[PDB]
Amino acid sequence: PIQSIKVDPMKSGGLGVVYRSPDKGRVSLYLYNDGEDILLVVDARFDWRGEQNVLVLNSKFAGGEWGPEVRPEGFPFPCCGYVTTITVRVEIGADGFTLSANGIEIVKYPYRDGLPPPVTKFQYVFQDQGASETAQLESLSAYY
Amino acid sequence: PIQSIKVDPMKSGGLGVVYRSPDKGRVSLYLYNDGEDILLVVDARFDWRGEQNVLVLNSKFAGGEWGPEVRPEGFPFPCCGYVTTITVRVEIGADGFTLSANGIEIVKYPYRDGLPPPVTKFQYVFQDQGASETAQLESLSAYY
Amino acid sequence: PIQSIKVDPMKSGGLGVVYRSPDKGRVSLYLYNDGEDILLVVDARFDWRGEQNVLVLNSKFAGGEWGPEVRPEGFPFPCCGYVTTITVRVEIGADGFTLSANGIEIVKYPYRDGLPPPVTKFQYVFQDQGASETAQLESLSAYY
Amino acid sequence: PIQSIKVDPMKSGGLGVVYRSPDKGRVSLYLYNDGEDILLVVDARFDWRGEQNVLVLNSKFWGPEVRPEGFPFPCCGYVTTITVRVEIGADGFTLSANGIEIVKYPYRDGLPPPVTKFQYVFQDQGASETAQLESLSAYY
């Protein structure tokens, strides 16, 4: 349900994850620096606090408050309560993060004030909301 | 919008397709014998004849009539009018075909009476129903 | 040891193979048009009629003689009589083929005059020469 | 040419690497615990001090060295993409390359999982084509 890989400080390249989606709950991906600031959360809400199939991007300092949510369209939430295998990729660009899902680009996310790279940790968190089918993590990768 | 591969008669291995889903229309995959009978259609209805996110599998002889529809759950249609990359595979087993999408097994389908392998041809067909994102075929594969 | 796909007339995309290499003998990939001209042969000689670890490309008319033979470097022939899986890809570009193996571009190859695409058939052929490990075909693909 | 991923300690699953090979030098893959013990190194010697195209496995805190056949060192001057996978099984590591099993390596006393670190290290020895790391993976 929770796994991380820590990388040698990363200012370019990509982080990827493959997982089987849950019918309920949320899958969260956290990109941290050593300060443990959240440079980016990619928070895919399957069914979460009354929201269905909602993707949320945000950042924040370690003991800190969420910035504004961004909510892109195009994340491959399966219909009808189904589940599937999802591959997600975060490019660490000069500009900001680039998020792709199944090789399709979802959103460009410019780096937030005082939170640019290097990334040093990439974390998967599945949180349940009484799902019939819970998320299964298959892999975590760093792309150089 | 229509593309096929022709193979030496296959009685095992697999046929795969990758494509970018459409927001409307249907993507059907046809597996034929040398007689041009349809041993199997894998009919992914994204938005077709007032149906939405429906998978239909059936068989019929060349000029004949469709037999009994099977409508399995789990095919990973995207929510919300979104598109994604879908990988589908059909194994040709001893007793039936095994259909999988994104590496997850969808259903097993016993060969219909007098419609057994060998498969000799595997064809992708997308038919529009005024989609704003039309299907894009990426590849067709034969597995030994 | 011989397998082929016939595709619809292809002026675009690519064609792929995946196989487990032989410790001797040759593996040839032929690209035909409808007339059965050889628009390209990618002939990988592991141990063949005097030669070891040599790559040969040519084209010929169905009738006629060969052309000037090109022998690129870079083809991943394994050392020491080992075998491995080889992935090979032939892009059908505007001006010639591009050959790659395991994702590394091996050579570009301008179309011989009188022998441009459409390509209508991609064929794999293994010919033994007393291998302790013969080749095994894993897949053939058309990319659009 | 040195990279690592540190993972929450793993007693099952797998570690993968993809890189483009060098024509000289060695690329070495290390599996470490918390104390930097070498639970296993997979040392692909393309051209390394007299040895050519040799695979070497071992562990340390040296000890007996295994030398499996079948690792896909390319012939001639050549380089390619290589995909190596190491499974953390119950009996030991299982190592494969380009989808093919190369050998099984029982854990050695004092050196069991969990694995906390997987590290790639290319050391050059005059290569005209240097190694290029492409990705490092953990499988769960």
Ligand SMILES: [Cl-]
């Ligand atoms: Cl119909």
